Design a protein around this ligand. Sequence first.
Ligand SMILES: CCOC(=O)Nc1cc(-c2ccc(C)c(NS(C)(=O)=O)c2)nn2c(C)nnc12
Lengths: 113, 113
Amino acid sequence: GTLDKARCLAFVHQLWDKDKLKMFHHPISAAELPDYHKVINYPVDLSTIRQGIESGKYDSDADVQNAVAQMIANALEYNAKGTEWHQQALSFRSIYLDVARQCGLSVDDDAAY
Amino acid sequence: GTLDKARCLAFVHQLWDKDKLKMFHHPISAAELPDYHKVINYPVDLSTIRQGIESGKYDSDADVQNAVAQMIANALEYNAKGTEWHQQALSFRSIYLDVARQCGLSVDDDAAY
Ligand SMILES: CCOC(=O)Nc1cc(-c2ccc(C)c(NS(C)(=O)=O)c2)nn2c(C)nnc12
């Protein structure tokens, strides 16, 4: 796999604009949610993903997609059913692979979160 | 957030016995599949997960379910659609939470792979 930085930044950018709560824009601090570190082993956010793309940290487009999946899974695990954070996370899970496709990324439909 | 070792081990054992191809029993070695580590960043197998439960490496029942999910995702990514290995992994993705429930574990259906 190759890292297509333009295609990967387009994908993050589309997700950033669809994030109406701005809940995925920045890393979660203990200051914000004191118990978050206790629940979530692999925190990740769209600013951190953009930096990972721009720096070449991700080896492939697939790794960027897996980072977005992880970010969405985190919010579904942490947040109770019915809260706006849980509901936007569910919406993201529903659309993120379509957004990836719409940016020209290859999606493994059977394997994808 | 408590690791329920008996129920997690029971869960791993049920998956072991349902693994007819034995494709999840042991770590994949480069000596058999030299490209495996190139494709798959997060290798995990039922023997490794059993050891992680036994040692208390996993912090929670959720972490054990996520390790099993990653094992299944690995097989769906690595094995081409149409192969018996890809097809068993499709089956496992569709039943692993059902098996977890049969072993008395709680599942997060919205979050789960
Ligand atoms: C019961 C409390 O639950 C939570 O507040 N959960 C979460 C909240 C945020 C979050 C961050 C930053 C902002 C600006 C906001 N926007 S707001 C306060 O208007 O909704 C939200 N992110 N987040 C992520 C990721 N995962 N869970 C959460």
